[PDB]
Enzyme design. Sequence first.
Site, PDB file in Angstrom:
ATOM      1  N   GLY A 200       4.041  -6.647   5.445  1.00  0.00           N
ATOM      2  CA  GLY A 200       4.462  -7.989   5.078  1.00  0.00           C
ATOM      3  C   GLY A 200       4.609  -8.166   3.580  1.00  0.00           C
ATOM      4  O   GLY A 200       5.494  -8.892   3.117  1.00  0.00           O
ATOM      5  N   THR A 201       3.738  -7.518   2.804  1.00  0.00           N
ATOM      6  CA  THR A 201       3.865  -7.553   1.351  1.00  0.00           C
ATOM      7  C   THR A 201       5.201  -6.968   0.912  1.00  0.00           C
ATOM      8  O   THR A 201       6.043  -7.668   0.333  1.00  0.00           O
ATOM      9  CB  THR A 201       2.707  -6.786   0.708  1.00  0.00           C
TER      10      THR A 201
ATOM     11  N   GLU B 294      26.753   8.212 -11.345  1.00  0.00           N
ATOM     12  CA  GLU B 294      27.859   9.020 -10.846  1.00  0.00           C
ATOM     13  C   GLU B 294      27.832   9.162  -9.329  1.00  0.00           C
ATOM     14  O   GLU B 294      28.889   9.157  -8.689  1.00  0.00           O
ATOM     15  CB  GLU B 294      27.845  10.394 -11.523  1.00  0.00           C
TER      16      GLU B 294
ATOM     17  N   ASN C 183       8.639   8.000  10.157  1.00  0.00           N
ATOM     18  CA  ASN C 183       7.532   8.944  10.124  1.00  0.00           C
ATOM     19  C   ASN C 183       7.527   9.919  11.290  1.00  0.00           C
ATOM     20  O   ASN C 183       6.962  11.010  11.158  1.00  0.00           O
ATOM     21  CB  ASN C 183       6.194   8.192  10.099  1.00  0.00           C
TER      22      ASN C 183
ATOM     23  N   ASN D  94       3.600  11.689   1.802  1.00  0.00           N
ATOM     24  CA  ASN D  94       3.871  11.243   0.440  1.00  0.00           C
ATOM     25  C   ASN D  94       4.435  12.375  -0.408  1.00  0.00           C
ATOM     26  O   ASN D  94       5.302  12.146  -1.258  1.00  0.00           O
ATOM     27  CB  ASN D  94       2.595  10.686  -0.190  1.00  0.00           C
TER      28      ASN D  94
ATOM     29  N   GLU E  61      -3.299  -7.262  -1.545  1.00  0.00           N
ATOM     30  CA  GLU E  61      -4.666  -6.958  -1.186  1.00  0.00           C
ATOM     31  C   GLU E  61      -5.334  -6.208  -2.319  1.00  0.00           C
ATOM     32  O   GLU E  61      -4.851  -5.140  -2.721  1.00  0.00           O
ATOM     33  CB  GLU E  61      -4.698  -6.132   0.095  1.00  0.00           C
TER      34      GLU E  61
ATOM     35  N   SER F 253       8.067  -1.357   2.001  1.00  0.00           N
ATOM     36  CA  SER F 253       8.150  -0.976   3.403  1.00  0.00           C
ATOM     37  C   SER F 253       8.638  -2.162   4.220  1.00  0.00           C
ATOM     38  O   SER F 253       8.509  -3.319   3.814  1.00  0.00           O
ATOM     39  CB  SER F 253       6.800  -0.480   3.934  1.00  0.00           C
TER      40      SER F 253
ATOM     41  N   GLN G  27       0.823  -1.205   0.000  1.00  0.00           N
ATOM     42  CA  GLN G  27       0.000   0.000   0.000  1.00  0.00           C
ATOM     43  C   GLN G  27       0.859   1.258   0.000  1.00  0.00           C
ATOM     44  O   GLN G  27       0.593   2.205  -0.751  1.00  0.00           O
ATOM     45  CB  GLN G  27      -0.932  -0.014   1.210  1.00  0.00           C
TER      46      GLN G  27
ATOM     47  N   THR H 236       3.276   1.269  14.247  1.00  0.00           N
ATOM     48  CA  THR H 236       1.936   0.924  13.787  1.00  0.00           C
ATOM     49  C   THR H 236       1.513  -0.471  14.232  1.00  0.00           C
ATOM     50  O   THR H 236       0.402  -0.652  14.737  1.00  0.00           O
ATOM     51  CB  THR H 236       1.860   1.024  12.258  1.00  0.00           C
TER      52      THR H 236
END
Lengths: 439, 439, 50, 432, 29
Positions: A144-145, A254, A206, A228, A71, A140, A11, A179
């Site tokens: 888990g993805t 470079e 974050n 973002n 997902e 990330s 996500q 989180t």
Amino acid sequence: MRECISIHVGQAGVQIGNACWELYCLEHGIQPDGQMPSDKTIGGGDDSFNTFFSETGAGKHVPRAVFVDLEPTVVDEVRTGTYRQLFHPEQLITGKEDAANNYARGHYTIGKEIVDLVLDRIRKLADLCTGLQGFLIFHSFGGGTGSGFASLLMERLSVDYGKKSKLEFAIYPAPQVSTAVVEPYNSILTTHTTLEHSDCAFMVDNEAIYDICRRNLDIERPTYTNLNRLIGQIVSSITASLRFDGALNVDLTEFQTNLVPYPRIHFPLATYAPVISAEKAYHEQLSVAEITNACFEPANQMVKCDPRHGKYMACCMLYRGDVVPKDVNAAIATIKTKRTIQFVDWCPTGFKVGINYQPPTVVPGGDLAKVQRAVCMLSNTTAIAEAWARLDHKFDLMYAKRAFVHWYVGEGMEEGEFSEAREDLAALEKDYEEVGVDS
Amino acid sequence: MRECISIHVGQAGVQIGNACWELYCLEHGIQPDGQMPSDKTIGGGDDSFNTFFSETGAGKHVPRAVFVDLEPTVVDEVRTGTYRQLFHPEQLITGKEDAANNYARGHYTIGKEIVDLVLDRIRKLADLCTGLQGFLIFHSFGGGTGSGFASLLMERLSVDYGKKSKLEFAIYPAPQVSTAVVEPYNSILTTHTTLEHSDCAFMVDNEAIYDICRRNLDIERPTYTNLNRLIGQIVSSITASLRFDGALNVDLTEFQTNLVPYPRIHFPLATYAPVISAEKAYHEQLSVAEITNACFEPANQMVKCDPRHGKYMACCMLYRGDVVPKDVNAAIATIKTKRTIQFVDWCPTGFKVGINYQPPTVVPGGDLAKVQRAVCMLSNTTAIAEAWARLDHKFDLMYAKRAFVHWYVGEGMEEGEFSEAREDLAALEKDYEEVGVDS
Amino acid sequence: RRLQEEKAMKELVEQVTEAQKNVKIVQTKLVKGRQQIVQEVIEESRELLQ
Amino acid sequence: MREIVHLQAGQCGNQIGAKFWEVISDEHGIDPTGTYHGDSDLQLERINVYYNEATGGKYVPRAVLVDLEPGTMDSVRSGPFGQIFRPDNFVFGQSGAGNNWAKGHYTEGAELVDSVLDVVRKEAESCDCLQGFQLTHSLGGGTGSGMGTLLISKIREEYPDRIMNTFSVVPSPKVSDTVVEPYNATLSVHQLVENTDETYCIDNEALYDICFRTLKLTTPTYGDLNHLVSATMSGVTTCLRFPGQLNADLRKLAVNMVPFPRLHFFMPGFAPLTSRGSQQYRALTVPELTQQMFDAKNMMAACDPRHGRYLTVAAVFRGRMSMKEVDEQMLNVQNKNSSYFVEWIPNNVKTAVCDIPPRGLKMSATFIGNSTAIQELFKRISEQFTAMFRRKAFLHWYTGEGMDEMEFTEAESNMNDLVSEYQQYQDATAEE
Amino acid sequence: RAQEEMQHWLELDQSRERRLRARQEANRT
């Protein structure tokens, strides 16, 4: 020519890719339809857009990116958006089951089912491009993805392409705020893969973003959109001399050549500047020396670490906007004699001069104001090693009694991988320690 | 000149012929009435239509094809259609009794009754034509009408015309999905006739069509109409240089001469490209190299076989539409150096260059979009021999206890023919394995 | 497979080093040849003198 | 006839070469189109040295651009004079150098080298007889330093009797652009002292300081430095471009100004460097030019020549003044400033006046001398190289390229030998 | 931790060394 392919996993990766693409389309005047409908009043767009976009026979622009996630909810969320007519549905691969902050399923029982499809997609994309230099892998550590899938895909990309640059961009779990709970479980295994199978890796958290926004932007209720936007601005600043030119062109190869002093130490410290709101960009004289001095301030770093605890070995220096070389030279002279900043007794100087004619643009509805010039720095120091130390301490205290490990045992993994990752991280921390030690 | 006669046996053959004829009339602007009523606004039609149609003294077009079927229901179904005014009722021979997936009756007690009629019809059709090159026999292995009757008629056409090319087009039974149960019974007897009495044979299944349509056209509810449309497009592509011209004409004899390396191995692998829907033909830049590379992918073959299991000996290469020779040269240079594609250690190169200036057309109500250029390939490889191996295995297992054999015994036919066909197939597979073995 | 690949690239770069050694030797031979040219020119001058 | 073939390498080299071409085109009266719009006399006779005779009088430049990045060409071609060059000479690769001398010399120096050798061979064969080859590059990158050394080695290998002169840019610890810059400089110095006739020293920080403290520019950029170096090399080459009373040439200078082949470095410089408000308030005379040509303030060196002794000095003038004033100034300078030049060898300054003044300025005179000031740069480079090579930082890239580390060892040995030689020739005593 | 503490003591020694280095630098200046 200078063309790259972006990879977006999870996500966070998907939303970051969306932010980057929308930033590119607004900064290049690319309309969401994919055409040039502005036949009455032109507002730009006559540039080198081949770096990221592609030109068809009908004047269509096709994004060159990989939007993969387990997902289907994120795919549906983006699909019902306003930019659905820009990309192609075949680029957004859905999924039945997801990992959702787990490396076990996402690395063995979920990851290995969708492999041929994404490999064919990326092979077709690479064949559609002429010059390839590096990749933009967005994932990330908490997700888990973006951990299992990122690892399993990069372990094949690094071996099907050894001569191509393999970048890394993800979120490092903050020691104070978090989180989920199983974030270090995935991080301890992802770090080994990103160290022993990749050339460079960028870590951000974050909490530092929250601190800088409440301190400069002065917002009481933040949101992921500004997070973002900052990352997209950083990415655009890094790859600024690829889409355009300058006095001294600053490409991918470079700086990654010099940004890596050792195969084990490829973890730089990014810092974007100026990070200010609209009212903070009006009554504030902005020069090069002040922002460069502000760049080394610990409060402005996106990683919570005190630079004075360690010392610098290599620094990569970049600029974007109307910048004058005299100001750069004056800033370099000021910083080289600064006693607060610490450095090894073996590298008297090192940095780059990226002069970028095009100034940074703005977005209608964002918080960033119109700044005449931007600046980005990528330094390397041993003062950041504390994050790995805290991560190892947490892993040790949470592995002694084997908390939430029977699940991974039932899914299927070797328990020795935890000890293997622990000892690898210990060796890496040692190496960082001896490198930080001078004569 | 380049005039050919089409033969349609069974329901599948009749429907395929109808699809081909309607495609030809729409692409040539031929109105369903048979004349040229467009006296106000012209939309084409000034070409060489004598290849398939015929010009009368009053400005009428008579199709040149053979529509024979046993069951009168199909003849009635086509007869009550909207194109009944185009053909002639004498070309659609009805019948009292049918085969309906049975060979013995349709080869001995049903087939031998209507012979003189169809022979006289085809003799008249050949006399009405000046130059004859090859035939277009459309039948099926599953259908009893398309197997016994096709065999008995071609056994006479071969002995009556040895100098004319004898093509073959039918549906190969898929190993996973199937329509009937006695399909191998008819197939084992039809393959012997098509091998020892014909010069070339084309095999396709329906499972691959289903896979490609759900994968590219993305349909949840397929139908036979699109199945016939794809076959009609393939047939138009292969005989594209007969109705029209181009840079390098490739007539029937031009490719069939090289498409047959050995008298026993005349079983090529067709692949039509691009097979896409309307939305799949808009935001997708189409060049020659990409589609040629996609033509060798196992996912786009109409025969479920992995090309990597064997290797290629002869390849026939075709194009249709605005194609540039430099792109063809680049694609050839790319594929000749591809390590994935396997070939004999013996033939460094072989292919053809068919440039057709006329781009492929579309149909109102179909699923094919407007594509600037098309591409078709016909290669020969030993990896397809697995289908014959599976068919022989199925025949062996279903012949050991003589399942559904008493019906054929009572109808009247030698039991030894099954052993003859089995040993002939074994010999053919042995020849294929010997050819596939390099030095 | 990857390790064999690095072996291959090490081989190609060592032949590159061989080539640059050949280049430097050729340049040295060029210098020697120029000196020899000077030698026979001196010889011709001496012949004219005698 | 006697023409000079010009070579290009490196983005900084490419931009300075383009600036020089624009400067000479403006001075000699060439429109951006390609025709001739001059109104002088000597701008037609010896104009074929850098140009080539073609139909309609459309002279074409003679310069081959060598680079590894396509991005430099679109920048240099979009300029007001980028449309006049020969696109064929613009030979470029697909992959950038990455500021790597080893990788650039190895990977991007095998399959692309043949094209540039073929084109330069064709250019040399197109003319009757040549003198030398000019190559302007920089040591800050893998393009100029990685390819210029190989090209010079190749051309010296094919045509030994040619002048190998260059204007490579020396690095500086205060103003750096590459982290591995000492490594590339160390690798390039070996080739510069082994297979190069002569080399001139170019520094950006000194030009910076000069244009700030004397020119007093508002926003000085690389364009100003390009203009300065173009004017410098124009003043160097006017001895052959515009003949006068006492003309000189490159090989005579290289022979007379170089005592030993191992020390072919120089120290260039232009005399009239004034601010904008002082142009209208100035006195054009010989002693002023001598003072600004002798002092270290006007010199473009990032060091101090006063730390050593002057070895070889050449004062090339471009104007119409005299001959007695130059020799008397030389004499009195040697008489008073006796502790600044080698006493063992008297009369270390060469006299050269060009009767043809430049365009736009009437008095011009450049300084080409080899003073004892590069020694500090040499020792500091040796020290930084030793410090970096002690623990072998930033070496896995070069090692993974394929070449070993013994090259660094032999290189540092050569640099130690050279600096020892320099320091023991610095104190050139008369006797025991 | 013990190891840490020790390592922390080593870090302190290194910092003392760096302070001496800074003293030397100031002397040079």
